[PDB]
Amino acid sequence: LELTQSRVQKIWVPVDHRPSLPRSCGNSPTVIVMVGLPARGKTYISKKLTRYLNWIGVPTKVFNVGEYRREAVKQYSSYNFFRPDNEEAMKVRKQCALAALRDVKSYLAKEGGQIAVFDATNTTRERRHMILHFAKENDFKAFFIESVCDDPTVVASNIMEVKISSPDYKDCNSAEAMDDFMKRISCYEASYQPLDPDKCDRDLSLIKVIDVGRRFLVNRVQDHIQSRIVYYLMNIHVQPRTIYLCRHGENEHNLQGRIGGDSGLSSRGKKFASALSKFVEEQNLKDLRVWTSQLKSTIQTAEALRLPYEQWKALNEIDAGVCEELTYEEIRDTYPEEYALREQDKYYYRYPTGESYQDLVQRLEPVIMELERQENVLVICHQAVLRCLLAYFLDKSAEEMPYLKCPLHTVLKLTPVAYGCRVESIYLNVESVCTHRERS
Amino acid sequence: LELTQSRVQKIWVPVDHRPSLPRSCGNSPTVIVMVGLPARGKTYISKKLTRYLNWIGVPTKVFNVGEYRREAVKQYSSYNFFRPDNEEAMKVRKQCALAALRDVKSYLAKEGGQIAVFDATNTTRERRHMILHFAKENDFKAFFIESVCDDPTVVASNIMEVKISSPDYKDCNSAEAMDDFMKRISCYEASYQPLDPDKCDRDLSLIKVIDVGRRFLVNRVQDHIQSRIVYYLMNIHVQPRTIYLCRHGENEHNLQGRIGGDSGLSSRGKKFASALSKFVEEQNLKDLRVWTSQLKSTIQTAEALRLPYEQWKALNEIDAGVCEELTYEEIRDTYPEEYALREQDKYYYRYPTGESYQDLVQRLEPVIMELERQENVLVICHQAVLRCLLAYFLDKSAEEMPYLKCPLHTVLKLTPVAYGCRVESIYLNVESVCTHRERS
Ligand SMILES: N#Cc1c[nH]c2ccc(Oc3ccc(NC(=O)CN)cc3)cc12
Ligand SMILES: N#Cc1c[nH]c2ccc(Oc3ccc(NC(=O)CN)cc3)cc12
Numbered sequence A, B: 001l002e003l004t005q006s007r008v009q010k011i012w013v014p015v016d017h018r019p020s021l022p023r024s025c026g027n028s029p030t031v032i033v034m035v036g037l038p039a040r041g042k043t044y045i046s047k048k049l050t051r052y053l054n055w056i057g058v059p060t061k062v063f064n065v066g067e068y069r070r071e072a073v074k075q076y077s078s079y080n081f082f083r084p085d086n087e088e089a090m091k092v093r094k095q096c097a098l099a100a101l102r103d104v105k106s107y108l109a110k111e112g113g114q115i116a117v118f119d120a121t122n123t124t125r126e127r128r129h130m131i132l133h134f135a136k137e138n139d140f141k142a143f144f145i146e147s148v149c150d151d152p153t154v155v156a157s158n159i160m161e162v163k164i165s166s167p168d169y170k171d172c173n174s175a176e177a178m179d180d181f182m183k184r185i186s187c188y189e190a191s192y193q194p195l196d197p198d199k200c201d202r203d204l205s206l207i208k209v210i211d212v213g214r215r216f217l218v219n220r221v222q223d224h225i226q227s228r229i230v231y232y233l234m235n236i237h238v239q240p241r242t243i244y245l246c247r248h249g250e251n252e253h254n255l256q257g258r259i260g261g262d263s264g265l266s267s268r269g270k271k272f273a274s275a276l277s278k279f280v281e282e283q284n285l286k287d288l289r290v291w292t293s294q295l296k297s298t299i300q301t302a303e304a305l306r307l308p309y310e311q312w313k314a315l316n317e318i319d320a321g322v323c324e325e326l327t328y329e330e331i332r333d334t335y336p337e338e339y340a341l342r343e344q345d346k347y348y349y350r351y352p353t354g355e356s357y358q359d360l361v362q363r364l365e366p367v368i369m370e371l372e373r374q375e376n377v378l379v380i381c382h383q384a385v386l387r388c389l390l391a392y393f394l395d396k397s398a399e400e401m402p403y404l405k406c407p408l409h410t411v412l413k414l415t416p417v418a419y420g421c422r423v424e425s426i427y428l429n430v431e432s433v434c435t436h437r438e439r440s
């Protein structure tokens, strides 16, 4: 039972003594079907879910039928394009949906994609029967996500927040765009057949998000990924809030250029901790949850706030294994092969008896799920942990993630707006060393 | 910002220089309300959910009204006790429910309990209004779990599996007990008012488990624990299956009495791996998922099976930190304080730069959730990991968990039956060292 440890990821694999003529061999993908009237947050759900799935390592892509339409029909004039009696535009819209499905097939069967989010109204049983036929013929699973809401306040808010600012309404003022969009919604209301898990859609795998996540109808969750999506949708919310992310104040290891360890705050780190308390106070937040790692430097930083805080072992810095408490110079001199391997593949590289950024993502997933549930949160953590969390909020790839700039004594203020996060950086005017290292 | 590291758990806490007269200060608990007709799996849900919640560290207890009734009324005669026209038994049954609620108040407000599972029919709005009044007056949260099923095959199967074997039917044969139980169910059908999240129960936090988990109605999930319960209920199933748990075959570190590391199989370990393949083959399982850790010894064991397997970093043995690759004699001689601290508090003890059994539980929770989703699974792991998983399946406490017997070259065959697991041990007749150490 001869095994070898892969140099980058440190995975034990069978020793592969390929024969004279080495031969390469060259689970089922899922089509997530968005369902609902316009301004029901389908694009918001599509984008957020795709961001989460990609971050956890499930290759996911959104196919928005409206973008195929904006490409086929140069400029948008009015709701008249969406009229059920508009024979020509109805043909164009069908062609756009079919062209998106063609790209869904290519993504899942030929590009290594695992999940395709089909972002359209898909309000009629006919359209959904056609998507099911497409899924069955291509051996793709189908999972439906319907967003149902009758509240006019919610509809008006969605139009104001992200519809009026759509490329379709570039030449329009807020009032014209709102009026045109209401008429556009009305075009879909007559033919709209909601999902019926009771009789018609009984055998379909679906989630009905009712009244902006107040209630859920979950039918036939087949697998792990659908179960995860359902859990995610139940944990996220659209309530306004702020996420503050920062590292512990400068520590003794930072001064010596040493990685890992459990060293305490330097004199400057203690100054940052005081500066952070003043900053937090000036934010005047009704309630604020404070999260730290179990490492001393983040706890000492939180201690300066005089606020209750919760320690998470999942927030502990990346484990450097045998390289813990060493400087990067000592790593290069004692472990040159290891140093070069990491520089070449920073995301997947695992330290011996240690971790990779890939392991960090797996550890941080419960942190992300809890961050989603919460409102105002301050996370006091570490450089690699912060890059991973930031890659989730900022939709950064696995390749970009180990190189994100997360300086010491700097708060990253995250405000959820439109289809992602607005990021503000706040340097708290306390000197520190620089721990950022660019690629080679 | 002076901190000290707690000796057992290794948690950084503010240095507590208590004044001359040290003063001690001396989230809201939840009442989970089971709802539904008899033989709807309410006790099955109650017990399984309690087992999971306790294992993850949420103190949980079941209060079954029927057990209070068996205590108040010595012997059970027939369904006549459950008649709606039985004035005396109706008073007794109410007294029993009130006595259970009294014990719910004492458990949550005075015993450090976090979750009380109120296991009764609670089929009428009147009973549920009374439970809500009790929850509001005691500042307890209320979360309803209703099990709805109209399938007579499911009802008959439940009566045959766990009702006929109830202490109520000790003097009865299978046919008498089944007949009496059907009449007993009928006593509840007239007054049964299902949960109505649409109109009446709109503001209640609830889950409706429809048709043995085929469908779910989820209303107003308020917090983290309710969200976790909902996710758990969506991942478990009642399909028949087998869980096989074993350790890797004996390794080189086992022979030297060394802890941790990433050593390979000894000659005996390789013999076990072959013996395991023969055992697996003899089980004649249509499909079998094989899970290993990322450590060499478990992968080499799986390699002998000639079956596809999946490596989980979450299955890696407990991290001994600074004590890794040391013998227990070398631990006692180099770290005597650490050795004695662990012996005194084996569950909570954290190795320096390492883990506790408490950390293992947190790491293994996604493993447990996936084990629940799956059918036939073989987990090839390590001594401490195995004790943790076994404590989940066998409902063992945190205190018992570090001392569970998990010998090498022995398969633990777990068969879900009634309200837990039947455990069969299969020694594969290959000698090894003993790594079990009893408490002192
Ligand atoms: N209708 C409608 C919506 C308008 N904007 C939205 C944004 C998101 C959206 O979808 C979700 C909203 C809420 C949740 N979950 C929860 O609120 C559970 N706490 C999940 C998805 C619906 C709409
Ligand atoms: N009615 C009825 C039941 C009879 N025995 C049962 C055992 C468990 C039970 O509750 C659950 C069954 C199933 C699930 N979940 C799933 O099957 C999702 N895969 C959750 C709870 C209902 C009944």
Ligand SMILES: O=P(O)(O)OC[C@H]1O[C@](O)(CO)[C@@H](O)[C@@H]1O
Binding pocket: A254, A258, A259, A260, A261, A317, A318, A320, A382, A383, A384, A402, A435, A437
């Ligand atoms: O992935 P990188 O760039 O080495 O950064 C992670 C490192 O940053 C630090 O947080 C500070 O230098 C170390 O403890 C950790 O090893």
Ligand SMILES: O=P(O)(O)OC[C@H]1O[C@](O)(CO)[C@@H](O)[C@@H]1O
Binding pocket: B254, B258, B259, B260, B261, B317, B318, B320, B382, B383, B384, B402, B435, B437
């Ligand atoms: O908690 P205990 O009894 O020390 O057992 C855990 C130990 O068992 C082993 O799996 C085998 O000795 C070690 O690798 C590990 O440290």
